[PDB]
Design a protein around this nucleic acid. Structure first.
Lengths: 101, 83, 108, 96, 95, 108, 87, 99
DNA sequence: GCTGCCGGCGGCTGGAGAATCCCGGTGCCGAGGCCGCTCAATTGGTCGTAGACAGCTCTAGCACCGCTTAAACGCACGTACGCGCTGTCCCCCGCGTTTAAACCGCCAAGGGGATTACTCCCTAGTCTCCAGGCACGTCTCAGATATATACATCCTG
DNA sequence: CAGGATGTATATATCTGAGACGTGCCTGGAGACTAGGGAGTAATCCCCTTGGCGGTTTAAACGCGGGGGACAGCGCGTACGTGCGTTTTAGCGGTGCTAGAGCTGTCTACGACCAATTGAGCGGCCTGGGCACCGGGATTCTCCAGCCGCCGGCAGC
């Protein structure tokens, strides 16, 4: 019987790359990120509250920063005659970016 | 499986789709945890200034003004939330 | 006698008195000139008109009669000089410009 | 119910009616434009005041902002903006 | 004519009170002057910006303190706010 | 009578009156509080003293009794807590630290 | 021959030895015969950004002489502030 | 018969030696002429201060020292010791002057 | 020789998920009239930054020759580049399914925010004193050599 | 596989010499002593919007299985960057030698300052109608996948 239909490895990845690049939706879920930000901000001020607008703005700024960092990481990865992004790649991209050292 | 760290709320599919929006087609297996670490580092860096701004206001809330001001101070301005 | 707004005599739809007050109370200088707010209103008007036209063109491209922040991001990032001006700016609900590295593409 | 806030909504709408007369603008886009124009205004005014302090002057005239925009905006926007400022100030002075 | 202005003698006194047997060159001296001026301008701008955000027309020690907290990283910020606080209490004790 | 300076009253070696005048004339706010110049002088004094003991330690290591910008860079770029503040600024006649990548080193 | 001394072909004056020493300070072990032009290009691009701002400062000052104030001042504007020139 | 250092021994000696120095890297009149030549394009009939020229030279020197640091790091990441144009291009792309 | 045979070669149509597009009505809410309030224009007078004019002088721009120093060419070579072979094994892509995101609704309430009287912390003016910049002025202690060896490097037996 | 000879560096004794460190001098800035006047501060109170609660409901994340292609080590052709020797070419430099315009002082004036009215621009506050959205469904759009004539060896004879 016919082998079940399968895309080749590395094509649906490009399809969803195209899908996400044209979409402005929030790639990170509301509740896990809000929980993370509260769990990481409780140390600065115990029992601190946030506004909904403030938390969505913070989340979207984090997404923009991380997506730019990832695009620079991919640029460095393709520069190093490879396609797989490696930990050394992300560290190098951060360290050129001037945020690490 | 109900007691978990809130940093792990940033799940593998979510970071994978963030990278896909970035424009990378292949990701290695040791990217997720270190990207989580750098993401949390950026979070503490921005929220430190945000909470400092809030304490200046003599208020217990963190309105969008403090977070946009903190982001602008860090070097990443943001539009649409007041200004 | 009869009064008239300074924006009408300045040929700009942007306010003049408002920018004058903003300069006055903004703690920039001890004094500001009379033509300084007019100049600032003019340059702000030009900037808004340019960015609005660039966003509306993308809106008509996406067959929308209303400007969405995604259109603003597309207009900002598409224009190279505007991208250089707003380089370290994060937009609300804008996403990123669609670009894929050609190396990642298949052979054919 | 009180403390009427202040914003550039009507001015951006009026500019739109003269660039794309049959085009609407979303509320989020309106907030983005208001924040952007406020940021650009703050940057330009800060540059103008900073230069005024630099050359030991205590007044901000059209020349200070002219040098600021020539200093801030690169490319064609600089020349177009200085031309717009010059024509606006000449028009204002002509009919005072 | 036209007396100029510099932070020379103050850094001089600081180094003499922490290093009785060490001198400073003229070019490094102007480097110290630029360091002091740049940090002073940074703190003053941050304080003015904070006061404008909080609808405040005055700058007290509190805005300076918060700028020190948010601008320098960690240990320097905490040490600097400690010294600033003790200095301001000492000054307010006999004004 | 009996005029005394604010720097002595605050136990500081930086001019409190001068810092207050600079704040007054710098167009930062319509008014300035009394303790703000004291706090500013204190923090500048701490920072200067901090980099100064680093520079003195570097000079004593380099067996010299004079402070030069080479010592200033050698002291600033060794501790990362000061680097995070002065990582963007460069100083005249500075140079860099003697760092060589391990791969560039020979086999043994 | 009083004024108007137009100069050309001066970017080449940075010799290959010179870039070699600069990169040795940067800490490289080897080099290629291909950087010597792009490093010159990044040089020219950097200087046009600096002195463009410097001459705008000078023109605002209603003067022709470009003091070190203007250059360090534009340098601080570009986010690359310099210490040791009266800043 | 003759004594020759290995291809890199003198290179390493230069790295470990010249890094400890702090003087200006490159001859002065070259930058002086170059700065005048570029400033001529923006506006003619200029007048430079010596301190301004020293500041420009030191700023450019530091900029390219940092740049060569970044390209050396990129090259050592690319499993190589030499440096190539793509290293400089990548470093300037991530830094953001060209983006 | 002149037949069989044997594997690749890529060219094509064909089976097959996904992406796109039009209708269709349903929501949702940018766009538009009203009121007054809050601020902006407007006369009416002031006074003080910033332009001009008259110089002064420190500083900016030049060429010149000894000279040496580093720049420049070319030279052999052993290395590091770039790449082919190969061989994991580690990411990928579906699949079932477990789970937590969200959205829904309704509260409870700590707190954000608009008014109030004032006070007291700051500002504005005069007079008074002095800390600090500047012009010198040194005597240094800071540099700068040529010298004598360690050293580690590239080989040899 | 262990030492020897060598271009590198290391101390280091005088020379030797620009410049940190005082030191008067004076002066504009700092500071002390009064009106005085609103900016912020508790006090007050009124929404409000943020935390918290618990059903659906459902897309989504997680563990797992198969496999395929990306990556990294090994080996090799090569080209070329480097150390080095031999020129040679421009920089260093102390020197007058020249003027250029920043710079300071002074007179002036005009443009911003601020005040007391006065009226409208617009922020708000509804409000009906016009535009974005969702679902079904038809339409393309690529993606991958095997069939087979053509092509090139592959063994005999």
């Amino acid at each position: 019987v016919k082998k079940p239909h399968r895309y080749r490895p590395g094509t649906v990845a490009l399809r969803e790359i195209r899908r996400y690049q044209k979409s402005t939706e929030l790639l990170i879920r509301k509740l896990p990120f809000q929980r993370l930000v509260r769990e990481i901000a409780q140390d600065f001020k115990t029992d601190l509250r946030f506004q909904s607008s403030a938390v969505m703005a913070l989340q979207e700024a984090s997404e923009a920063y991380l997506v730019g960092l990832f695009e620079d990481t991919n640029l460095c990865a393709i520069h190093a005659k490879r396609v797989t992004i490696m930990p050394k790649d992300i560290q190098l991209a951060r360290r050129i970016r001037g945020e690490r050292a | 499986k109900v007691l978990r760290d809130n940093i792990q709320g940033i799940t593998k599919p979510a970071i994978r789709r963030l990278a896909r929006r970035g424009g990378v087609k292949r990701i290695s297996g040791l990217i997720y945890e270190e990207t989580r670490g750098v993401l949390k580092v950026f979070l503490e860096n921005v929220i430190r200034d945000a909470v400092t701004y809030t304490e200046h206001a003599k208020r217990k809330t963190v309105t969008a003004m403090d977070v946009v001001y903190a982001l602008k101070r860090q070097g990443r301005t943001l539009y649409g939330f007041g200004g | 006698a009869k009064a008239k707004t300074r924006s009408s005599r300045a040929g700009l739809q942007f306010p003049v008195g408002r920018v004058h007050r903003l300069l006055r109370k903004g703690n920039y200088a001890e004094r500001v000139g009379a033509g300084a707010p007019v100049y600032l209103a003019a340059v702000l008007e030009y900037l808004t008109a340019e960015i609005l036209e660039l966003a509306g063109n993308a809106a008509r491209d996406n067959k929308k009669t209303r400007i969405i922040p995604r259109h603003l991001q597309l207009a900002v990032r598409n224009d190279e000089e505007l991208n250089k001006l707003l380089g370290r700016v994060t937009i609300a609900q804008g996403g990123v410009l669609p670009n894929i590295q050609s190396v990642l593409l298949p052979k054919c | 119910r009180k403390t009427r806030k202040e914003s550039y909504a009507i001015y951006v709408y009026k500019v739109l009616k003269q660039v794309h007369p049959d085009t609407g603008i979303s509320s989020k886009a309106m907030s983005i434009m208001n924040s952007f124009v406020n940021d650009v205004f703050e940057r330009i005014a800060g540059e103008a005041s900073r230069l005024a302090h630099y050359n030991k002057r205590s007044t901000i005239t059209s020349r200070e902002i002219q040098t600021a925009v020539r200093l801030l905006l690169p490319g064609e926007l600089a020349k177009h903006a200085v031309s717009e400022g010059t024509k606006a100030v000449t028009k204002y002075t002509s009919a005072k």
